[model samples]
Target chain A: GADQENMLKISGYPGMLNTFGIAQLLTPYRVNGITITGAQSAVVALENKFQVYQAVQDFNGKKLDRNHKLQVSSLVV
Target chain B: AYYLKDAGFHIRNIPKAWNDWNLFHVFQNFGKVSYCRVVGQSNDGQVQLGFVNMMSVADADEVRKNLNDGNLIGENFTLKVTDHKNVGGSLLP
Candidate 1:
């Protein structure tokens, strides 16, 4: 968990593929719990290994957009 | 064997005409078939679904990619890969 990285980030299109893709990609990493909300594709804080949380941010920080209504989830294994 | 079991896939809507051999022929092209079975209909015996086992998860992925978008055995027989875990032995009447 210490060496975890930003594996993927997709904006606006959070359909089956994106959602399942997250599961497929992260499941292997033993991260199952996820959190999703409406926010700018902005910076999100990773609470910890057992509890990985995410939020999106831009360079200028807090670039709120209508498409920000997104999902953020991961495996808590 | 468990490797295939963990990474296996199921395909439904098989024609009553097709048998284990036919399913093997179609799926083997993508990867080695560890195991395969046809289940469906009454115990009277009939083809209803295809249970395919690949040697590895990667092989199953390949088979899914091919079958996910295209039709199998042309117009008459179209097989779609179902990703539900362990649908092979869960045959119902």
Candidate 2:
């Protein structure tokens, strides 16, 4: 519970495979030397939740101190 | 009944240089990793504890058996791998 604040939850449709694929794509990047410290995946109610450490930064430089939510709709196919 | 089995494993004394991706890469050699986490660290920011969930129970068992008390990272860095059994029963709450 102490690490909950640092957790970033990403939701995807279909199943765990899709969600985990998304996570695998994103987990490789690091921000200012801080990389993903924790990660988890679960399937509930037909939705997949991929949780990871919120150490990622936006590449566009718009958001600096928070995790960036990448737009994956275009890659959903 | 098989759905209730836990495939997650816990790691201790992780090297300071290792990150989530590093852990994933090592574990993926055995089986598919569904989740990986660096759960705890020392006061000086050295990584201490970690957790990983394999897609197969057999893979998890293999990881624990092979990695436990092994100095795979370095000659001096011994790792402790075990079954994860926290109060929440899983890596994520």
Candidate 3:
């Protein structure tokens, strides 16, 4: 998936917005894939055309703490 | 640690009832932290997780995200990250 820049598209069921909301969770939490944890008001980091861009880092905490957990999963194409 | 009570399913596989749950949690736990999320596995069998956190207030002349800082718990390790966003999709009571 090189040069392709792995992209993720999430389309949940209808009204699924009421369920385990991602915007809700990801709002106050940060994520860093591996080693480099990004948090503290770090919301959406869109990798549009190969470059990483963040919206607004306007919180006030020193360390934007992030959390990740092992979860059950399903796949759909 | 973010209450993912039932962890399974990618964002696309999420049921109609599980949406906004993350926001609820974030709003509820809007003191020290501001966001949270679980992990799921990809089709290639690789481990990965996705999370987006933020601080509640700001610091000296610096907004949280503007300053690039949030409540950090652990490093963005591969194994650790996947455990957050790569969870499976299962609906059961």
Interface RMSD for each candidate model?
A: 15.8, 6.9, 9.7
Which parts of model 1 have CA positions greater than 4 angstroms off? A1-77, B1-6, B42-47, B69-75, B84-93
Q: What is the C-alpha lDDT of each candidate?
A: 0.49, 0.49, 0.27
10 residues in a row with least lDDT, candidate 3 chain B: B74-83
User: Cα deviation of B24 in candidate 3 (Å)?
Assistant: 16
Candidate 2, A2-42: lDDT as tens digits: 23323333332123344445444444332111222224222
Q: Rank order by lDDT, top first?
A: 1, 2, 3
Ranking of candidates on DockQ, top first: 3, 2, 1
Model 3 CA deviation exceeding 4 Å by range: A1-77, B1-31, B57-93
Q: Pairing residues by index, what is the TM-score of model 2?
A: 0.45
DockQ, cand. 2: 0.05
Per-residue lDDT for B2-80 in model 3, tens only? 3343221122222222334442233223233233344454465443333433343331113222222233222331111
lDDT of 2 by residue, B1-93 (tens): 122256777677787988877777777777656567788887777657887777667877777666535433545566667666545544453
TM-score, prediction 1: 0.41
Q: How does the DockQ of candidate 3 come out? A: 0.08
